[PDB]
Amino acid sequence: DGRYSLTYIYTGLSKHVEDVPAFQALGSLNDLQFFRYNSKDRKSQPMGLWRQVEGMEDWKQDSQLQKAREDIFMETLKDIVEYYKDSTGSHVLQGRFGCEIENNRSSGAFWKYYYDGKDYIEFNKEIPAWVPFDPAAQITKQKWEAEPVYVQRAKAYLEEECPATLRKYLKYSKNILDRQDPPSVVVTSHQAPGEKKKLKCLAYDFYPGKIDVHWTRAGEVQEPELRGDVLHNGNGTYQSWVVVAVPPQDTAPYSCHVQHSSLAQPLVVPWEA
Numbered sequence: 001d002g003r004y005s006l007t008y009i010y011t012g013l014s015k016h017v018e019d020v021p022a023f024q025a026l027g028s029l030n031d032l033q034f035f036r037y038n039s040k041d042r043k044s045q046p047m048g049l050w051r052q053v054e055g056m057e058d059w060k061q062d063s064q065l066q067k068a069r070e071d072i073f074m075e076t077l078k079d080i081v082e083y084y085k086d087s088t089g090s091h092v093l094q095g096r097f098g099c100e101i102e103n104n105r106s107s108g109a110f111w112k113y114y115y116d117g118k119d120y121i122e123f124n125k126e127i128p129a130w131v132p133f134d135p136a137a138q139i140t141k142q143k144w145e146a147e148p149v150y151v152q153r154a155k156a157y158l159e160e161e162c163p164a165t166l167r168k169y170l171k172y173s174k175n176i177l178d179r180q181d182p183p184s185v186v187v188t189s190h191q192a193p194g195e196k197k198k199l200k201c202l203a204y205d206f207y208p209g210k211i212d213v214h215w216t217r218a219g220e221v222q223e224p225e226l227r228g229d230v231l232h233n234g235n236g237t238y239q240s241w242v243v244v245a246v247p248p249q250d251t252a253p254y255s256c257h258v259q260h261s262s263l264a265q266p267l268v269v270p271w272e273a
């Protein structure tokens, strides 16, 4: 088996401006985002290719769960601002938590919070206990540990529940995370009035992201003039391109090359002037 990771991220603002939710949650599996939730709609919604996967999660229930998480998250943020006696300003609390497995074996886990960009508090499941970094975090740790069961639960979440959720999801995500979609390529050239002729090789609809795309001038790999790429999450596909300017009197042969894990061998696509 391979490497898989479930990550969640919470963003809370103490004084949100118009059109920006006070609380936002998102989650991802490896390089793709699978869901989202904010304090405006208050609904957990699947995203990307997960909008078509059925029976992996009850989104109506997860909505109730996020709503609960939100309340606690924002009270935490509120208590910090209270501590610093400065609710006139705009502060943010971002939290990150998730786990990862490799070869069906749990290979790691984390749980950390940031306040106004600085490390606030994090959980060390080995102890098991919360570690405070900011003075206000001393109060927070006190609260999150007022009962013996609390740390036991936090330890249980990273060691059992989370890695469980990740396994459940991989069962319904084989047709998503394990894909090996070969790249379609399209060579095209554009002539800017006054500038050299420019050839653009585009690789698309491929996955995973790792790819090699380069032009060749009579066999000699050229140094791209421009270059870029992207990941369309709604689709779960990547696109990558390269560009080269050609002398106004160059006859040499121009062929694009593409290598990718899903290809039995590299592809080649010459440009017909």
Ligand SMILES: *[C@@H]1O[C@H](CO)[C@@H](O[C@@H]2O[C@H](CO)[C@@H](O)[C@H](O)[C@H]2NC(C)=O)[C@H](O)[C@H]1NC(C)=O
Binding pocket: 205, 232, 235, 237
């Ligand atoms: C996945 O989504 C991407 C982005 O929405 C698709 O790329 C677009 O493809 C159309 C042609 O079908 C172009 O007109 C757009 O310009 C492309 N988007 C841009 C601006 O990059 C892609 O075709 C989709 N792939 C699949 C297989 O669904």
Ligand SMILES: *[C@@H]1O[C@H](CO)[C@@H](O)[C@H](O)[C@H]1NC(C)=O
Binding pocket: 104
């Ligand atoms: C790990 O994967 C196996 C199948 O390969 C599955 O039966 C098992 O429940 C998973 N985790 C464990 C060790 O419980």
